[PDB]
Structure formats: structure tokens, C-alpha cells
């Protein structure tokens, strides 16, 4: 309309779409670099996960207190520059070793095939730290200042951000796959480096624009281990604490669709009912869970939006539970009807808690409580990897669901204790 296309609400969807696309192409590239190395997805993939999770679990509160105490534009631009420079610097190494593979040049401990993995993981970890800083600042700060005082416009911005994430999580791997199989997987990596280089400048510009277009953003209000407990007791002294923990418990889940494609995904061929539809259906219930949020939130409010988005997830995971017992092939039918029909309650619950954290957390503590929620989210994602490794046998799976459904039911009791304490012990 040329009137909506220049709003600061749209130059934010755009600057977010570009960042998410860059991050996701680069994740699929690094996921195909882990095939020029140990072909297994258990040891080395889970160790990549452990490294990124540990890094953010440690530095979440320091990153948060850096987001607060400094500025709004310098923070966004520093984090943007850092992530895109680290992405091109990892893509260059990825290429310069994706060509010269299996050439041990020196015999000492700095040899190639392992210093390459160490360097890729360190630079990927810096990329992830920077992108977490950008997530904190942009979403939890600029969506709340841009959305003004409007509890139904902020709901729409949250659901919109999530829908962009959900469609990019599909379309970015397919684009980079057609590039990496069209010509070759070396020009692919060089291309993702170039893409990230140009979109760095584009997003630099878009952020500067959104800053000029809403003047409410220019208005601001053992030190490392000091500000690690000055952020983990604050996050505990908050009245909203019990919801941000009930959310963190939904991350220690093996039934998360991305991980079930690793183990217990055999006997089904690609493009028939797996990555063409079963990867494309979980992107439908991810849009169909963000449209239930904005709807339920009007009819029944933001605390009973989390209470129906909880007995929805729990009730569809009673399908993944009757599966492993099969009481009166079938079993793989249900387990995937559960993992997919329970993303309606998981993406609707993720959005209430995101919006409770947004309007109930003071502006001064807005980055600290939002770093310590990230750290809480990985601390439970870490204990997710610690459980897939040392328990990787096919026989030992019938239990990685029951102790992955129990952290769901235990994260929806820490919300039912939040609800019953906020709006009517006997009123619901």
C-alpha cells in the first residue's frame, strides 16, 4: 500500500526475515559440513549442541546486562555486525576446507581435520551468542516499544514473528539444498557467505530506519560472576517466574519434531511422507498454533490462553504415549500424529509466556530477565542432549518419551500454579 510498506512495524518484520533466513541457511550449511566428518548424528551433533547450549547458559545474564546498561542502537548494530562477521568467517573456513579435504599437512596436534571442527564450533558459538543478543534486544525490547500500549497489537507482532520463523525453517533449507545440489557444495558455502555479507548492510539500514521512525526507542532508563547471580535471583524474585520456568520445561523434550528425524525415523522414505509432508505438516500446526493464540487471547484472556494451550499439548501427547504401549505400521502412525498435533498447544503456550514476560517485566530489568530466561531454556535443552547420548540404543526409546512427556506435565503444573495464584483459586 506504500503506507503499510514503510511502517516501522514492517521494517521490523523485514529486518527479522532477513536475519532468520541468513541464520537458517547457515545452519543447514553447517549441518552438511557435519557429513564431511563423522557421519553419525549422535556424538558430534549432540556435542555441537552441548557447546552452544553451555555457552549461552553461562553468558545469558552477562549478555542481558550488556543489552540493558548500554544503548538501543549500538547494541543492535554491534550484535548484527558480530553475527554476520562470524558467519562469513566460518563460511570461509568451511569452504577452504570443504575443498581440500583429507589433506593432513602437519603431523602435530594442530592437525587439520580436528582443528577444523574446533574452529567451526568456536565460530558457530560466537555467531549463536550474537544472534541470541539480537533476539533479546530486538524482540523483547523493540517489539514492546514499537507495539506501544496495545495488548492486541503486540499479540499480532508476536504471532507474526513466529510465523516468519516457521516458514523460514522450511524454505531456507530447501533453497540452500537446491543451491548445494544444483552446482556443487563449495559455491554453496561461498554463496551463503556472500548473502550474509550483503544482508548485514541491508539490516544495518533497516534497524537505523526503525530507530528514526519511532522516537520512543531513543529513550533509555568478579563483575561477570557478580552479574551472573544479580540476574538469577532477580529472575527468581519475579512474580512471573513460575511461568518462565513452566516454559523452560517444554524444551527438555525428545518429541520435538526436529530431533525425531534423527532417531526412530527409519523405515520411511524421503519426499513421500517425511520431508515433503511430515516436515511440511509440522509447519502447518506451527501456524495453526499462532492463530489460536491471538484468538483465544481475546475471548478468554492471557492466563486462560496458557491453560487451554496446555491441556491441548498434554492431550495430544497422550497419543505419543498410547503409541509405545499399543493397547486396544501403527506405532509410527500415532507417534507422528502426536508430535505434530501437539505443536498447536506448544506454539500457543510459547506465545502467552512470551507476552507475559513482555508486559510484566520492568523496563530497567528487561534484558536481564530475558537473558536468564534464555539460559533457563538451554539448561533444559542441554539436559536434553545429556539424555540422548548415554541412552542412544533403539530399545532405550520407549522411555525417552515417558520422561519427555513428564517434563511437559511438570511444566504445565508450574503454570497451573501460576494461574491459580493470579486469577481465582476457585475461579476458572
Amino acid at each position, epitope marked *: 500500500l506504500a503506507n503499510y510498506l514503510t511502517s516501522a512495524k514492517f521494517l521490523l518484520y523485514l529486518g527479522h526475515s532477513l536475519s532468520t533466513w541468513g541464520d537458517r541457511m547457515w545452519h543447514f550449511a553447517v549441518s552438511v559440513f557435519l557429513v564431511e566428518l563423522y557421519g553419525n548424528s549422535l556424538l558430534l551433533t549432540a556435542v555441537y549442541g552441548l557447546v552452544v547450549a553451555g555457552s549461552v547458559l553461562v553468558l545469558g545474564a552477562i549478555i542481558g546486562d550488556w543489552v540493558d546498561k548500554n544503548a538501543r542502537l549500538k547494541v543492535a548494530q554491534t550484535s548484527l555486525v558480530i553475527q554476520n562477521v562470524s558467519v562469513i568467517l566460518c563460511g570461509i573456513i568451511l569452504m577452504m576446507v570443504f575443498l581440500h579435504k583429507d589433506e593432513l599437512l602437519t603431523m602435530y596436534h594442530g592437525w587439520v581435520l580436528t582443528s577444523c571442527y574446533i574452529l567451526i564450533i568456536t565460530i558457530a558459538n560466537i555467531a549463536n551468542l550474537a544472534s541470541t543478543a539480537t533476539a533479546i534486544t530486538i524482540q523483547r525490547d523493540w517489539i514492546v516499544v514499537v507495539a506501544g*500500549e496495545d*495488548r492486541s497489537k503486540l499479540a499480532n507482532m508476536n504471532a507474526t514473528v513466529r510465523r516468519i520463523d516457521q516458514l523460514t525453517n522450511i524454505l531456507a533449507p530447501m533453497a540452500v539444498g537446491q543451491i548445494m545440489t544444483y552446482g556443487s557444495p563449495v559455491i554453496g558455502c561461498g554463496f551463503i557467505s556472500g548473502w550474509n555479507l550483503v544482508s548485514m548492510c541491508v539490516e544495518y539500514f533497516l534497524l537505523w530506519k526503525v530507530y528514526q521512525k519511532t522516537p520512543a526507542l531513543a529513550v533509555k532508563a568478579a563483575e561477570p560472576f557478580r552479574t551472573f547471580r544479580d540476574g538469577w535471583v532477580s529472575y527468581y*524474585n519475579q*512474580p512471573i517466574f513460575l511461568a518462565g520456568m513452566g516454559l523452560a520445561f517444554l524444551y527438555m523434550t525428545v518429541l520435538g519434531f526436529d530431533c525425531i528425524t534423527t532417531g526412530y525415523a527409519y523405515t520411511q522414505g524421503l519426499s513421500g511422507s517425511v520431508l515433503s509432508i511430515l516436515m511440511g505438516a509440522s509447519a502447518i500446526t506451527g501456524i495453526m498454533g499462532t492463530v489460536a493464540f491471538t484468538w483465544l487471547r*481475546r475471548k*478468554c*484472556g492471557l492466563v486462560r490462553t496458557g491453560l487451554i494451550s496446555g491441556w491441548a499439548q498434554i492431550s495430544c501427547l497422550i497419543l505419543c504415549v498410547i503409541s509405545v504401549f499399543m493397547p486396544g505400521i501403527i506405532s509410527v502412525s500415532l507417534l507422528f500424529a502426536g508430535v505434530i498435533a501437539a505443536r498447536i498447544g506448544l506454539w500457543s503456550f510459547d506465545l502467552t509466556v512470551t507476552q507475559l514476560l513482555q*508486559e*510484566n517485566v520492568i523496563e530497567s530489568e528487561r534484558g536481564i530477565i530475558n537473558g536468564v530466561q534464555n539460559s533457563m531454556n538451554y539448561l533444559l535443552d542441554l539436559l536434553h542432549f545429556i539424555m540422548v547420548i548415554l541412552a542412544p540404543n533403539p530399545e532405550a526409546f520407549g522411555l525417552l518419551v515417558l520422561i519427555s512427556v513428564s517434563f511437559v506435565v511438570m511444566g504445565h503444573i508450574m503454570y497451573f500454579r501460576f494461574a491459580q495464584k493470579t486469577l481465582g483459586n476457585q475461579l476458572f
Partner: antibody
Amino acid sequence: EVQLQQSGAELVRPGALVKLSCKASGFNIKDYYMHWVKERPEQGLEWIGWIDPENGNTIYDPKFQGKASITADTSSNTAYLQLSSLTSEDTAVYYCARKRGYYGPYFDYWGQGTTLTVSS
Amino acid sequence: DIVMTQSQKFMSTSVGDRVSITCKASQNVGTAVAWYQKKPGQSPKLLIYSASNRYSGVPDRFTGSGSGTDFTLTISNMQSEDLADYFCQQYGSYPLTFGSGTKLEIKE
């Protein structure tokens, strides 16, 4: 300039009804939660309840759940409290207050107070 | 329910004196305590939220401190525009409860 102006100075025979009004100016009643608070003569503040004007959800203090009804009209930008079956104990100054989240750190803006006298 | 308690109903002070008003919860609120001041025949105005933050535009001699269960408002170098009532609200959980108040008074 944000204000909340209240109807004032009602005198009510006991056992009747009364409705006390709180008209907002300079913000949208709909972006907030509206709280009612009671201050008895020489007594502490007491909380009656809130109403979410968007969907009309009301939460009350269990000692007011019988005889307090908080309603709101966004079109008029105004909130209301209805006290029913009045008694001598009901005489107090009623305040209308404005809070942002379910856990907003404060009541930044307050109503001028409405003295209610229940006597015969 | 959390029952906020203010032992002193009265505090006898003098101008230029540091007066410390104390408030005590009945459960662990955390830092969920704000401080209001009301003068006779008026509406309560904010001073200090989340037990330490100083609301934007109140003089810099009002300080707030405490955590967990025992909290304190602190007036340094009291002036003559401070003789009022002070009470602590807790927003840790619903129903909200207010402190029963503490009235300052110049001391003769």
C-alpha cells in the same frame, strides 16, 4: 495529561444499590486493568477487584465477591463499580486505579476518591 | 494471603533527620513491594517500586531497600513536605494487600 475523574459524594439508605463511576482521560481504558480500592474512615487501603475492559474479566477480593460488581464501557472510556445490599460498614472513600500488566509494579495514576455514606 | 504489616503507626521526627519506615510481609514476596505516600484528603502517589527503584520525578532523598520479607523506605534529610502517610503494597500475588500505614509527625 492522564486523569481519572470520579463521580462524587453519594448518600445512600442501607440495603439499596449504588454505582460509582471512573472516567479516564488521556489514555485508553482498554490498554489497562482497572482496579477498585476502598479506604474506610481511619483504616487501611483494601483491594476490591479489577476488570479487563477488553473481554470484561473481573477478579475480586474474596471478601467482596458477594456484593461488588465491576463493569466497564470502553466506548465511554469509563469503569463502574456496583455495591449492593449496602450496610453501615460500606461507608469509605473508593479509588479507581490503573495498572498495566497482571503484575505491574505500581498504580501510577489514581482516582480523586469518592466518599460513599450509608445511613438512614 | 500475604499480610503486609507496619509495626509503627506513628514516627516522631524532626526536619533534617533520617527516618526509616519498615514494612514486613507474611510470606516471601521477593522484591514485589511498592511505596505510596498520601497526604490528608488526597490520593496516594508513588515513590518507589520493586523495593528499590525510584519513580521518575520524586526527589532524590527518598530511598528504598530490602528484599525477601523485610523492607524499608528511607527519607534522608526530611523536609516539611514529607509529613504524610506511607504504605507498602505487595504485588507478588492476588489479592493485593496494602500496608496499614505509618504516619509521620514533627517532634516537639
